[PDB]
Design a protein around this nucleic acid. Structure first.
Lengths: 101, 84, 76, 100, 113, 21, 113, 97, 84, 100, 21, 76
DNA sequence: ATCGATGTATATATCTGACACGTGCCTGGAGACTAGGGAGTAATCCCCTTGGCGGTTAAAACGCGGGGGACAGCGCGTACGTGCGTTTAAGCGGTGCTAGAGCTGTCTACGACCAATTGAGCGGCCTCGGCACCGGGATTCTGAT
DNA sequence: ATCAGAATCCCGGTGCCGAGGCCGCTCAATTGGTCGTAGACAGCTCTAGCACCGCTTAAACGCACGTACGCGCTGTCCCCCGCGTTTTAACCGCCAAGGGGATTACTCCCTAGTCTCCAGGCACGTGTCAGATATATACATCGAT
């Protein structure tokens, strides 16, 4: 094969982080995100209707929400000096913000 | 052909990664993808309820943008640009 | 024909009635068995107010159709 | 006599105190403990109104009726507690509805 | 003339809160152009439901420390126990409150010592 | 199935609410 | 008999916002029994101050990416830079916003001999 | 059937734009931001002006009210300029006809 | 006497410890006492301003309880029991 | 030798039980007051206080810092370091967002 | 020394506010 | 006697005046040096409105007491 | 250290539809007037706040000594980043269908508003008992052995 | 565990001050009543939401490989906790004085309400240029040799 050039591990992300912070577009692929709602929608009431605009709002907020989640979350494992996140961090971070308790 | 396949699994292992990039996360553990989808729904849960709740209080069968808005504000998440 | 009524206590009263039976008749029977005079009584069907002259089939009240009991308090 | 008299400072205390005997005939309450409740009301109370308010605009209603409040209730209160609150208020309305 | 008895809307709901007084508040509360006649009633009872719902917890908790007179601590100790109510008041703090006795496990004693 | 302020005032289960603690 | 002309309170303040329209809003805004004649003017300009104060930041930031037409990202990129404004809007999120490019040091790459 | 004019601050926004930036344009979405953006601040203001009334038991919101609320609501130095512009406005409107 | 002095150092190394106990903190680092007093003031700073700000808006020379209250509420800290 | 010394840390765990058990205010009253009047002076000279009103701060202030420590406690715990460190506050506050 | 809505409108330093970034 | 006036621009205008000098005189001098007619002018002292017939010592206006300049715009 | 390929950066030309403009039509603000009650001001009151003083008494301070926790170094084990080939379904724009929102039009019920009568609710009052205080004896651990 | 040995808890006695209760006045609520309008409700049209399909392909999935990070271990050094004694000022109780906030009666400025009058502001239409999209090319740097 004569030696593929492989970017050192982690180098990809640091380009993506530059990239995905550089532009504005929505990371969740749209249509499935919609379907996710209609389910959850159904439980509170059957047979409900959406301005396709209105769905976009969630998407805008939802991504945005999780974004802000990661930052403190990022800080967490960093505060543990572990360059990788761990699920407890979310559980930690949310517990901190107080959405849980 | 039936009903009810997957949904929440429709937020894909690569997709969330993209966010994490915007989140400034260098390396990601595997189990993250589980709990992530847990929180996401839980968030969307109470959010949707209210906009729904407004909506029925409007006697209108359709969720609008304004609905989602007023959901976030009494939530504390208040947003712009889809309002009005 | 048997129907029920649900109360503030959730009490479920057994009722042997007929679709042509008047609210006048019904409350009296509740006055009859439960001793509570209609003066302080009203029964509900789907939130609507019941007049004596109305019968059960007037509201399309079917067998085992359960109703919402009220104590209307005049005085106090 | 009665100089400069302290204008009656209204509370829910008595109202609070009545309720107490219905749930707990025995127990007493300290003013500080009472002071909690009296404040405690308004906070919930204002939270409610403001939301009822917001409904008006969003429906462009000029008036807050019952239907308003309930809608706000389901918003403001969490979980099952709401439904009972819904219930008691509802059960109240009907009972007040037939009044007079 | 001769209004001839009296009756209070609160009594008319058989409820302890002053429907009249509340109904006054909203009128000046700048909360809407008009006030629905029905609303305050419905609005009133809700509080009259909550006020009990909380106190009941306190009283039981008040009996726990075996003092016949409710104190703030109880209210605090009461509120944080109900898993619902805590989310109602979480943003709010109480005078003389204190917090629930709580300890993190890893901080507990032993090592078997 | 929420409503218009109906007469559905359904349950006196609040004791179970109080049980939640 | 002669209005003869006309003048707008906005012009009377030489300010761009519709004093009249705002002054209409408060009247129905259920914000008070009455509306002070002076207030809306004062109230108006404040916004007319802010609206510039923000846009100015955007425009400069808009020129930075060298696109003559302001976009949302700029506004977002604008707002989070001002150390004051961020605390105004911190609870608020923006459509098409994104966030500032930011990286934690310890996560930075290393040769760094 | 069809009209009733949906009022915005857009034109008002758009005027301001040329004074600060004669060149630049704006997208409706971007515009849509501003129009909403106003009310949010705007309502925040009123409600606080309101609260003042009770706490002084005033029945009326005048200028003096708003300013007080301004210093509350806005952070840091930005307030003072806001205070300034509003003030400078009031005087200039004060002497008007 | 001269002019007012230490103050903020008047929150004592043992005192804060008591809180930390109520905070459920088993062992405490030394530098905590510094940053602690930093935050405390910073908190009290914006808090006091508003109650003050209300107070002058009242044209009254004295801070009351109601003042502190309305400070916390538009802050988000809303409190009970000293409010009338 | 002879003198019985509670093993290190044992004291606190009694205090934590203790100081969570009772309600009284941990900050010494009067100095806390003086702290205000300074900060008070800067915004306006010559100001007055209902001694009640001061108590509010004290109530809130202690309460505030209390809630601060919990997450703060969790922090170093999340670092498995049974002792707190100042960065934790700086961490925790930046999490809550009082800073940024 | 805050006031009643005085004429003290003192400073056109806002550029320094804009400098803060 | 020298005093100043501060503007919307913060311009500080040098003024050689006398405590008995009328506002009529003063604005005219500003009209005189700055060419701006009083029709669009008013000056402020401690927020109070200045009438021509008033003089400086009428307000207890002292030397180097600085004032708030106004352009009163009629038209537009 | 020199060498190559990868991704990004940038240059071009290119095609498209959104902003920004001009025209004309209408609704919300301007103008002018009245009548009424809010608030401002001044005149008296007394309550609350500050202040200053001195006695015991706990709390702050300070130091001492050594234990265990922080932190740094290292090494093992493995999970997560990267890349590629395989696989799946998002996004596109294009067509068709009617549900439901939004705009409309009439009638009237329900709320505000005014006045006159009535007791619910508040402050002021005193006595009384739930509970803060404690000195002794009951238990439930901690550390030493 | 097994020991004494603290420190804490639970207990019976005492004691004092705020609960919780009643006295009586008053002002907020209630009653009876008129007037008009907000909004209910039935009619009607016209947007955009849902549905459904297939050509295209960018994204997602799944697996292979190894690298560099999570974490577990150790090992040292010192920063806190415990505890005894030495030093300050918190606290309580007591009286003293006047500032300021609370309440009251009065007049007048200011704002709501109302009407008639018209351009500011809106939708609507339209034409072009800022910017997005596609494609070639130069610049930077990472990692392989």
């Amino acid at each position: 094969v004569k030696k593929p050039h492989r970017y050192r591990p982690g180098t990809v992300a640091l380009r993506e982080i530059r990239r995905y912070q550089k532009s504005t577009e929505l990371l969740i692929r749209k249509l499935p995100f919609q379907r996710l709602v209609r389910e959850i929608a159904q439980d509170f009431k059957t047979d409900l209707r959406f301005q396709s605009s209105a769905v976009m709002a969630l998407q805008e907020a939802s991504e945005a929400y999780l974004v802000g989640l990661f930052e403190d979350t990022n800080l967490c494992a960093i505060h543990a000096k572990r360059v990788t996140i761990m699920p407890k961090d979310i559980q930690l971070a949310r517990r901190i913000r107080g959405e849980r308790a | 052909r039936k009903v009810l396949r997957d949904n929440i699994q429709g937020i894909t292992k690569p997709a969330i990664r993209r966010l994490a990039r915007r989140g400034g996360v260098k390396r990601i553990s595997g189990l993250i993808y589980e709990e992530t989808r847990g929180v996401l729904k839980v968030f969307l849960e109470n959010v949707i309820r209210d906009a729904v709740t407004y909506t029925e209080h409007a006697k209108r069968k359709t969720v609008t943008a304004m609905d989602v808005v007023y959901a976030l504000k009494r939530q504390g998440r208040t947003l712009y640009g889809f309002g009005g | 024909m048997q129907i029920f009524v649900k109360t503030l206590t959730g009490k479920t009263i057994t009722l042997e009635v007929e679709p042509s039976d008047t609210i006048e008749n019904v409350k009296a029977k509740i006055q009859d068995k439960e001793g509570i005079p209609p003066d302080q009584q009203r029964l509900i069907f789907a939130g609507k107010q019941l007049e004596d002259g109305r019968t059960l089939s007037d509201y399309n009240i079917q067998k085992e159709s359960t109703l919402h009991l009220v104590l209307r308090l005049r005085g106090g | 006599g009665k100089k400069r008299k302290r204008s009656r400072k209204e509370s829910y205390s008595v109202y609070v105190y009545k309720v107490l005997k219905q749930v707990h005939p025995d127990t007493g309450i300290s003013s500080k403990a009472m002071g909690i409740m009296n404040s405690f009301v308004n906070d919930i109370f204002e939270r409610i109104a403001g939301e009822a308010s917001r409904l008006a605009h969003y429906n462009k209603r000029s008036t807050i009726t019952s239907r308003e409040i309930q809608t706000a209730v389901r918003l403001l209160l969490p979980g099952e507690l709401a439904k009972h609150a819904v219930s008691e208020g509802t059960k109240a309305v009907t009972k007040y509805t037939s009044s007079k | 003339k001769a209004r001839a008895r009296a009756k209070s809307r609160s009594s008319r709901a058989g409820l302890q809160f002053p429907v009249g007084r509340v109904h006054r508040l909203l009128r000046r509360g700048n909360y809407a152009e008009r006030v629905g006649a029905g609303a305050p009633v419905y609005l009133a009872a809700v509080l009259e439901y909550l006020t009990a719902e909380i106190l009941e917890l306190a009283g039981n908790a008040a009996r726990d420390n075996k003092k016949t007179r409710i104190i703030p601590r109880h209210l605090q100790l009461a509120i944080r126990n109900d898993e619902e109510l805590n989310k109602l008041l979480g943003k709010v703090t109480i005078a003389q409150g204190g917090v629930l006795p709580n300890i993190q496990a890893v901080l507990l004693p032993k090592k078997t010592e | 199935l929420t409503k218009a302020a109906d007469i559905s005032l359904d349950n006196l289960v609040e004791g179970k609410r109080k049980r939640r603690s």
